[PDB]
Design a protein around this ligand. Structure first.
Ligand SMILES: COc1ccc([C@H]2Sc3ccccc3N(CCN(C)C)C(=O)[C@H]2OC(C)=O)cc1
Ligand SMILES: Nc1nc2c(ncn2[C@@H]2O[C@@H]3COP(=O)(O)O[C@H]3[C@H]2O)c(=O)[nH]1
Ligand SMILES: Nc1nc2c(ncn2[C@@H]2O[C@@H]3COP(=O)(O)O[C@H]3[C@H]2O)c(=O)[nH]1
Ligand SMILES: Nc1nc2c(ncn2[C@@H]2O[C@@H]3COP(=O)(O)O[C@H]3[C@H]2O)c(=O)[nH]1
Ligand SMILES: Nc1nc2c(ncn2[C@@H]2O[C@@H]3COP(=O)(O)O[C@H]3[C@H]2O)c(=O)[nH]1
Lengths: 433, 450, 450, 450
């Protein structure tokens, strides 16, 4: 079109991938044509054609793609062919792109070494990929694998340059010249940068210096590689590791104090159900990390209408509703758990997010006189009484795993003291009922 | 009908299906690459393959009869279970794994057992059984380490098979890199074949070398790719085992790091050697008596119901002796057993002093305490386990001599574990329970008048 | 004068004393073990040793002129500085460093430069400089890698010297493990000698191997011990590198885990897709502008007086444009910014709604905010940068047509970030200055009357 | 008896039993596998084994005499200690360890020391020492690195013994992989036997290779298994050592990460150069005096009492100079120190401003602070260490003008360490002691009137 958004445009991601491929062609093929003799005049036109195609990609990015990138300075600026372009020209991205497009004709591939300086496009494409692509540790694995492959690629080109500098086959250390040059130099790079060893030992001073530096860089690059993979796996499995650590700490706590297998099985069932359904052990730790507006809006979009459906809170101010939505505590109940007991006093209101509850009564109990599905509210009358003079009329069991919200007393009071008008409303509602 | 996934029957069948899946994932590639292994014991492989296929059919039967969880309730309707199973990609994987490819034994020959490589598509049963096992077992970290070790073993075995098959494709003994000629008596043995292939695979996947270098370009490519597979996949699982072993001692390392930070603090601020020795004595007591773990941080995710039941089961005997619990209306305890916080006191600690603000109530989990005199040498009476005190100053009382201040000083002889109970928590529990308030006020009056 | 340690002059002298200490720590053992290195450049080594000793004298003069903070003030007394230096162990180490051992040359000959090994005892100065560098570098992880590489190179160089000394003591060329014959022209090159010794030491101290195997028992012992030291060195390198990787990726991993957690919460709940998109876009905007971390949890370590004027210097352009801040006195701005809170807002959040009691008043530092009607499209007035609203709900006027409620609706436009001042904090700052407590009321009355 | 486990005598006996346990864990397998080691030093091994068995018996006696903590108190009843120790797994391990298998020497001969492998079962005592040393040693990272290096040495030595025993079972010199023929003069020596086995084990456990390749199937299998051991257990120990070495400077790691985050905030935010230099100077002072980590985060894992007399001990020299406490009754500092918060102020920082609300006591730990006139140029007398300032505003008196405001403003001449104490904490401390209260009141009124 005429003005694209770099943050959320898939076409811009595709073009940035094309720029990444051009930059990758430059980075991966400059040392090949510098060291290996793969730029013979028989096929030099192919190299020139692909270099000029990558330069055309660079020119298209610097002219008709990076100039029309909208930004924010307090508001979205989509001024086509105005200060939207001027922000790009004042940015370091334009300076790096123009420094990366330095024209050196003079056929030495090192003159194309400025083309490797368009690395900001690669980082921008990466940052778009942790956004638009879920399960982003796969791309990070691919990226660190490509980093290792490029390090071995550079080491193979360096080894071939060292071999040709001393002459091929002049010593057992250098590349002899038999077979595919890139594959065997890459074999040397693998045996070296991973510090596997097993290579013919260096003889001359230049060979020993090269092998020393290549083993030192290999030890550090192998450490970088193993640390990167450890970080990727630790971040990708951070939630699973944390859940397993908490569950195993709980299990060893119960095994320390000889908790019976019924309670242990119930706690393990809660842990597995909470991890499988919720995806996290406590949603409140996530909610307190958020900004207050995001947390409030998420409480709205979860259960605002369900809370507003009850007649007790109708007629009160909406800000108290917002506050109690912020203060609702979501808890799951295992099957056949007593959510309410007949003798137990009432303190809290239950709002079923999911699951079914059953109210027991009649002769000797064991009779479902009413079942409540998801979205129902029971236990609200306990919110009306003050001083603790409330009790549940009948015991309520959870028929299955029931995720439900809690509004306990002294929290509703804690937000009642904030709103005196709602305080009078709930006082008269308690006196009426 | 209906099998419950959380039941023992489902886990037993998970083991009974993991056995053929492990058998496939090892022996299918083992027989495909090592031709002598397939040819020598072909009757045993036929019996085991038929048994594994039967178990695969019974596993698909179970997957039509296992109940899923809809709105928290187990589904017993057979049509819903069948439709749910067939809607999933697991049904496609099972169908792909149980296409009869053994008919190609009559077309390709008996020496091509890779035709049942599709039986490897039952890997989800393996992974489900391993996820279910670590939840049930009492040694989850040990099982996770063994599972990753198993993963290392099967990857080494697969690379051994791939190396032997690549040597077969190039030709045995054509150069030094490949497996030697089969006509050699030492290297023609099946055990030597598999074991030397395993040795090559172990040396390459661990990035050791010490094997004959490649000669042909395809061998160079395979060696490079296998070293890369041993650096990005094998080293990852090795680091995963290291991380599991680190997670075994995560609480131990956290406690030791806290001790080390405190000791560095005492070293820099020139704390006296006696105080450093007694801090070290406190930490040695903490580790020796197994009190390094706090139930508040471990159980913080659990609900009030489950924390309440666990805390009653842990503290049953010590809460039996407490007078307000199980002797009064006894509905109070569930509200307070969540609210009790454990504290540990060294010998000679003064938990409260006369003229000090009493904002908290103590219930003795264990330890000998003493209502000491003003100087402290004389002890009026010794409080045992299950005793509770500090209730006089925590509440307003009729005829209060001092009010909001401790009336006696109590010191712990020996170590002591106490259930601290704050004033706000006690008032939260007691504003709704007037009988316990009356009983506690009477108990406070009985000592306060005297 | 007296040199302040925190000044840049002390850091420059730390570098100027670190150069002779590094020169000693490498080249003294280099010349002691490689005899041709000492013999071929003896005049240059004598000049460099004399220069290093002169710089050591100047360094001990500097420590007599380096002030220390007693009672928070730098000591300018020369005698007190001299006693403070001489009471330190560093005075003993510096005196031991500058004991003239070159006279032992006249007893031992010029082929023994290990006699000035005591010049190593200035090592702490070297460490101190790098310590200071790690505090003052703009590239902390680059310098961490440089420091680790430098230390490993010194240890590898020392072990190369040790290996050459062991080859000399055993005798060159008597077996395949030692360095070969010096009398050979290729092996006798000094560059070849040092470079091959360094190659051997890099091989052994990084557990790569690739060395000729030992022949003698002492060689086997030394190679086992040096491979254990190499296990330690490789573990140090791997641990430091992995810790750096974790340090670089900590913010990315934490905020990506926040994204993953909020995504899982939205999928598990029944949050509408529009709010899911708004949430992901808002987090992406927070990371893209790199302002994810709140200023309360990042500025809480440095002191409050520093924190307030940090907030002044960071948001100077926004605070200078406010009607309330820097109006006439420009003194409340220093105090109020610490208690002031930052909150970001997506477009269309409805920060204020009609019919809701105000909890806090809002300061627009960035973005344009409209005052919308009930329809949500018509904008009455657009609030510029540094503006404010929410004044009349939390402020009280004796004649008010609104009963403690907001009168206007403000809709956010274009990813606005703004400051907030709470109601209790408003009274806390209101009791401070009388000009504010009259100016806010007279500003709000005119808005309230219409 | 009775032996207190927390006492130093118990730790000394832990060392005295750790020495024979390590002796067994090395030498039993060393003499079992290397037959010449047992044969050539038979009388010395007999004496050392008898000494180790005697020490094991005395350890059993100590375990019978070791007091356990029942109900908080140490148990001194003899029969209770016998029944407590006799009911543990440790008693069974001690009995099985001290089974007199040496009677087997007559039966199996003098060449079978592996019958003393049961003496390894006292290993837990060894581990207990490593739990007790690491808790109490002033260099815990150094001891941890040494302990895991010792574990490396144990595993390498055990693998050396296993390699030599496998070579013995196969036959010395039978093929190239095993240890060479022991009738050769060079390789028949016991020292050469042990050190080449140790070199082989070091190469194999570090996954270096560089050893003769296996020939037999059992040799290939053992090399696979031992390389797997060296890449799992040995490399896990390597990763643990690298993690500890990279985290020796844990407080420095946290403080340097804090500096890096704040400096990244400065450079990305583009804060002014002057205040960036100011913050760099503040953190330079924080590291130079090592005031980086806060005492609350370090000490918060201690009880309230322990922190109370730790804060008594640390600040005692400047608490005794305080006019408020340690002079009237010498018990007020025992009552309340933990409520004091240490805060550090830069030179030129104004602690108090003229005529503002005051809520802190500001007890000077260190530094020079000056009462200033309103102009800011002319200053009055400078407060010394241990003095107190700011107590007029925190406690107001009726009849005095501007009691709640500040009588004067305070400027820090240098970096001042102060104890900020809340006014409510001062009321809580001073309601108990009225004499110190009126002693403060008299001087406060005297300096408030003028
Ligand atoms: C490919 O799978 C592998 C996974 C882990 C490793 C271990 S073995 C080891 C054991 C002791 C010291 C050092 C090592 N070495 C270097 C070995 N010398 C020859 C270079 C490593 O690399 C170790 O890894 C770590 C990151 O500690 C090896 C292979
Ligand atoms: N006892 C009773 N409770 C019901 C019935 N229908 C719904 N409920 C709900 O079950 C709840 C049990 O606890 P409460 O007494 O607090 O509130 C009760 C009502 O909300 C009914 O028919 N009988
Ligand atoms: N004053 C007093 N307190 C006692 C006695 N025996 C037990 N106590 C307990 O010691 C406690 C000290 O703190 P409180 O005054 O709060 O409450 C006191 C009682 O609970 C006694 O004989 N006299
Ligand atoms: N009612 C009203 N409020 C305005 C107008 N312009 C800005 N505002 C601000 O919008 C705010 C909404 O909350 P308040 O009612 O507390 O205070 C209001 C004013 O601060 C206006 O034209 N009318
Ligand atoms: N006004 C005044 N204050 C002093 C003097 N010496 C010490 N101070 C302290 O400086 C403090 C400044 O704050 P306050 O007015 O609260 O309390 C003041 C006194 O505690 C003095 O000579 N005059």
């Amino acid at each position: 079109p005429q003005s694209i958004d770099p943050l959320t445009n898939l076409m811009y991601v595709l073009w940035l991938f094309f720029v990444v491929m051009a930059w990758n062609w430059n980075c991966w093929l400059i040392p090949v044509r510098w060291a290996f003799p793969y730029q013979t005049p028989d096929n030099i036109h192919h190299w020139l054609l692909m270099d000029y195609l990558c330069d055309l990609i660079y020119f298209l990015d610097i002219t008709v793609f990076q100039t029309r990138l909208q930004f924010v300075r307090g508001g979205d600026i989509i001024t086509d062919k105005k200060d939207m372009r001027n922000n790009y020209l004042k940015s370091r991205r334009f300076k790096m792109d123009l420094l990366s497009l330095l024209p050196l004709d003079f056929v030495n591939p090192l003159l194309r070494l400025p083309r490797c300086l368009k690395y900001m496009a690669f980082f921008e494409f990466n940052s778009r990929l942790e956004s638009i692509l879920s399960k982003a540790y796969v791309y990070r694995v691919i990226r660190t694998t490509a980093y290792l492959l490029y390090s071995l690629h550079l080491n193979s080109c360096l080894y071939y340059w060292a071999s040709a500098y001393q002459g091929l086959g002049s010593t057992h250390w250098v590349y002899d010249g038999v077979g595919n040059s890139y594959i065997r130099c890459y074999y040397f790079a693998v045996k070296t940068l991973i510090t596997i060893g097993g290579l013919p030992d260096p003889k001359t001073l230049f060979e020993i210096v090269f092998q020393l530096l290549n083993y030192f860089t290999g030890v550090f690059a192998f450490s970088v590689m193993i640390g990167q993979m450890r970080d990727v796996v630790g971040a990708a499995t951070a939630g699973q590791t944390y859940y397993r650590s908490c569950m195993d700490s709980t299990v060893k706590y119960m095994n320390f104090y000889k908790i019976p297998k019924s309670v242990q099985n119930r706690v393990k069932t809660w842990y597995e159900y909470t991890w499988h359904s919720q995806g996290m052990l406590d949603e409140s730790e996530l909610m307190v990390q958020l900004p207050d507006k995001m947390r409030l809006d998420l409480a709205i979009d979860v259960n605002y209408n369900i809370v507003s459906k009850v007649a007790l809170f109708q007629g009160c101010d909406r800000q108290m509703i917002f506050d109690m939505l912020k203060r609702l505590r979501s808890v799951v109940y295992l099957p056949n758990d007593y959510v309410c007991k007949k003798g137990e006093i009432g303190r809290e209101m239950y709002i079923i997010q999911a699951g079914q509850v059953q109210v027991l009564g009649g002769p000797d109990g064991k009779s479902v006189l009413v079942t409540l599905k998801a979205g129902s509210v029971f236990g609200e009358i306990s919110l009306l009484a003050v001083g603790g003079g409330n009790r549940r009329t009948a015991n309520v069991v959870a028929h299955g795993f029931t995720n439900l919200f809690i509004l306990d007393k002294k929290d509703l009071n804690e937000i009642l003291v904030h709103y005196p008008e709602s305080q009078k409303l709930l006082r008269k509602k308690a006196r009426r009922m | 009908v209906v099998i419950d996934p959380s039941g023992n029957t489902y886990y037993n069948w998970l083991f009974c299906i993991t056995l053929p899946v492990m058998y496939n994932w090892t022996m299918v590639i083992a027989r495909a690459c090592f031709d002598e292994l397939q040819s020598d014991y072909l009757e045993y492989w036929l019996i085991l393959d038929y048994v594994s296929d039967i178990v695969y059919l019974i596993d698909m039967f179970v997957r039509t009869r296992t109940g899923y969880l809809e709105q928290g309730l187990l589904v017993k309707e057979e049509l819903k279970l069948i439709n749910k199973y067939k809607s999933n990609l697991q049904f496609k994987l099972d169908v792909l794994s149980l296409i009869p490819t053994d008919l190609l034994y009559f077309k390709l020959g008996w020496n091509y057992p890779e035709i049942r490589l599709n039986r490897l598509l039952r890997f989800s049963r393996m992974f489900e059984f391993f996820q279910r096992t670590e939840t049930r077992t009492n040694y989850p970290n040990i099982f996770r380490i063994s599972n990753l070790v198993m993963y290392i073993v099967i990857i080494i075995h697969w690379n051994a098979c791939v190396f032997y098959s690549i040597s077969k494709a190039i030709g045995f003994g054509n150069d030094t890199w490949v497996y030697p000629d089969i006509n050699d008596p030492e290297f023609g043995r099946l055990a030597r074949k598999y074991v030397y292939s395993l040795y090559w695979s172990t040396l390459t996947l661990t990035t050791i070398g010490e094997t004959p270098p490649p000669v042909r370009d395809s061998e160079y490519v395979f060696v490079v790719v296998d070293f890369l597979i041993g650096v990005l996949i094998f080293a990852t699982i090795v680091g995963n085992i290291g991380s599991m072993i680190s997670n075994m001692n995560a609480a131990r390392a956290e406690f030791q790091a806290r001790i080390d930070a405190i000791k560095q603090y005492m070293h820099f601020r020139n704390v006296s050697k006696d105080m450093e020795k007694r801090v070290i004595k406190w930490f040695d007591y903490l580790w020796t008596n197994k009190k390094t773990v706090d139930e508040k941080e471990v159980l913080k995710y659990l609900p009030d119901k489950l924390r309440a039941e666990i805390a009653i089961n842990v503290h049953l005997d010590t809460l039996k002796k407490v007078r307000i619990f199980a002797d009064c209306e006894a509905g109070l305890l569930v509200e307070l057993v969540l609210k009790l916080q454990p504290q540990v006191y060294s010998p000679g600690d003064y938990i409260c002093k006369k003229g000090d603000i009493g904002r908290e109530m103590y219930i003795i989990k264990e330890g000998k305490l003493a209502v000491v005199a003003d100087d402290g040498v004389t002890q009026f009476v010794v409080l045992s386990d299950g005793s509770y005190f500090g209730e006089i100053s925590i509440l307003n009382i009729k005829g209060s001599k001092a009010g909001n201040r401790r009336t006696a000083n109590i010191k712990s002889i020996g170590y002591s574990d106490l259930f601290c109970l704050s004033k706000d928590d006690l008032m939260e529990a007691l504003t709704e329970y007037p009988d316990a308030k009356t009983m506690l006020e009477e108990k406070g009056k009985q000592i306060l008048m005297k």
